[PDB]
Amino acid sequence: AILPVTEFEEGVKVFMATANGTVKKTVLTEFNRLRTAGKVAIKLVDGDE
DNA sequence: AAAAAAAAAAAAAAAAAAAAAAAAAAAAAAAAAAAAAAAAAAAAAAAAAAAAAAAAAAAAAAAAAAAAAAAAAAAAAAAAAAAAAAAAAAAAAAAAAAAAAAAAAAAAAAAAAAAAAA
């Protein structure tokens, strides 16, 4: 659905996500440092959003 | 009894394979850190709810950037020819369960033999 771009991850950079159903959440980028094809979830998107 | 094929003699042509010994790399299979994910507790920011409020869409109307018309000119994209990449359709296959034929153990009983008694 959405692919943002990141130059290099940093210390206190806070990641901001926002769904089509008018619901938003803010997450810390340090929990996305090295996934390795890892299907880590971010939100419990309710319904079709 | 006729036909056909194997095998063996001896000088010629031409091939193939198993291990030892050390040191390095490359596959390939395991424990074991390490982090997602999930179940089950308490816990706490958000919607609700209500009263109270004032900031931006309406409305008048000028005017100033505009989208259609006209013209000239540049040349992107579309369809027709060929030439490569990459994936389903269909057919084939090597182990693999099923069946059938030959080797080893079995005793019942007797022929021939060896041995000895009176």
Swiss-Prot record:
Function text: A type II topoisomerase that negatively supercoils closed circular double-stranded (ds) DNA in an ATP-dependent manner to maintain chromosomes in an underwound state. This makes better substrates for topoisomerase IV (ParC and ParE) which is the main enzyme that unlinks newly replicated chromosomes in E.coli. Gyrase catalyzes the interconversion of other topological isomers of dsDNA rings, including catenanes. Relaxes negatively supercoiled DNA in an ATP-independent manner. Negative supercoiling favors strand separation, and DNA replication, transcription, recombination and repair, all of which involve strand separation. Type II topoisomerases break and join 2 DNA strands simultaneously in an ATP-dependent manner.
Similarity comment: family membership: Belongs to the type II topoisomerase GyrA/ParC subunit family.
Remarks, miscellaneous: When the enzyme transiently cleaves DNA a phosphotyrosine bond is formed between GyrA and DNA. In the presence of quinolones this intermediate can be trapped and is used as an indicator of drug toxicity. The enzyme-DNA intermediate is also the target of a number of topoisomerase poisons, including toxin CcdB.
Domain of life the protein comes from: Bacteria
Effect ascribed to mutating D46E: In strain: 227
First-to-last residue of the parent protein present: 633 to 681 of 875
Name of the protein: DNA gyrase subunit A
Quaternary structure (record): Heterotetramer, composed of two GyrA and two GyrB chains. In the heterotetramer, GyrA contains the active site tyrosine that forms a transient covalent intermediate with the DNA, while GyrB binds cofactors and catalyzes ATP hydrolysis. Can form a 2:2 complex with toxin CcdB in which GyrA is inactive; rejuvenation of GyrA(2)CcdB(2) is effected by CcdA.
Compartments where found: Cytoplasm
Domains (record comment): An N-terminal fragment (residues 1-523) can be reconstituted with GyrB, but the complex no longer has negative supercoiling or ATP-independent DNA relaxation activities, although it is capable of DNA cleavage; ATP-dependent relaxation is inhibited by novobiocin and non-hydrolyzable ATP analogs. The fragment has ATP-dependent DNA relaxation and 30-fold improved decatenation activities, unlike holoenzyme it preferentially binds supercoiled DNA. The C-terminal domain (CTD, approximately residues 535-841) contains 6 tandemly repeated subdomains known as blades, each of which is composed of a 4-stranded antiparallel beta-sheet. The blades form a circular-shaped beta-pinwheel fold arranged in a spiral around a screw axis, to which DNA probably binds, inducing strong positive superhelicity (about 0.8 links/protein).
